[PDB]
């Protein structure tokens, strides 16, 4: 089993703070800031099974929205966490992702995002009942 957590932040300084946390936990940092980069990454994740679970950072919603569906085909734990200066932009994206039926978190402060990054590190180790439809 492998878990994929997607972070959405436009705050450059936070992106680096997250990377520090992810290196402290031992998770694999990969940056996506381009539409061609994400479809490369999805294959790398599929080809390599037995190693640490990956943390993807991005600033663009159109990228993330692809990967929520792609990773869902690949057969992994999808997780979404988003924070930005525009609260209006956070909530309008999130409500659509809840309508897709995905675990998506929303925060205002960068500190709250860092909490949920650390929370994921234990919450990702869930009892994955593989026969997942009861």
Query: Could you give the order of strands across the largest sheet?
Result: 2-3-1-4-5
How big a fraction of the residues is strand? 15-25%
Termini separation comes to 18 Å
Major pleated sheet: 5 strands, parallel
SSE-based structural type: alpha/beta
What's the β-strand tally? 5
**CATH-defined fold name:** Rossmann fold
User: How many helices in DSSP terms?
Assistant: 5
Order of helices and strands: EHEHEHEHEH
Helix share bin? 40-55%
Oligomeric grouping of the chains: monomer
Shape: globular
CATH architecture: 3-Layer(aba) Sandwich
- Domain module count: 1
Give the class-level CATH name: Alpha Beta
Gyration radius from CA atoms, angstroms: 14 Å
Describe the model:
With 134 residues, the protein is of the alpha/beta class. The longest helix has 14 residues, at 12-25. It has a single domain (1-134), classed as Rossmann fold, CATH 3.40.50. The protein is built from five helices and five strands; from the N terminus they run βαβαβαβαβα. The protein is globular and about 40 Å long. α1 packs parallel to α5 and α2 (35-47) packs parallel to α3 (61-74).
Keywords:
monomer; 134 residues; alpha/beta; Rossmann fold; five-stranded parallel β-sheet; 51% helix; 19% strand; globular
Topology:
Elements: E1 3-8, H1 12-25, E2 28-31, H2 35-47, E3 54-58, H3 61-74, E4 77-83, H4 87-100, E5 104-107, H5 110-123
Parallel strand pairs: 1-3, 1-4, 2-3, 4-5
Helix pairs in contact: 1-5, 2-3
Report a brief summary of the structure.
It is classed as de novo protein. By secondary structure, this protein is α/β, with parallel strands linked by helices. The protein has one domain (1-134): Rossmann fold.
């Amino acid at each position: 089993m492998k878990e994929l957590i997607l972070i959405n932040t436009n705050n450059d300084e936070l992106i680096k703070k997250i990377k520090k946390e992810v290196e402290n936990q031992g998770y694999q940092v990969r940056d996506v800031n381009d539409s061609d980069e994400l479809k490369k990454e999805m294959k790398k994740l599929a080809e390599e099974k037995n190693f640490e679970k990956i943390l993807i950072i991005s600033n663009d919603k159109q990228l993330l929205k692809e990967m929520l569906e792609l990773i869902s085909k690949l057969g992994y734990k999808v997780f979404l966490l988003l924070q930005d200066q525009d609260e209006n932009e956070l909530e309008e994206f999130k409500r659509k992702i809840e309508s897709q039926g995905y675990e998506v978190r929303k925060v205002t402060d960068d500190e709250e995002a860092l909490k949920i990054v650390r929370e994921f590190m234990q919450k990702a180790g869930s009892l994955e009942h593989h026969h997942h439809h009861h």
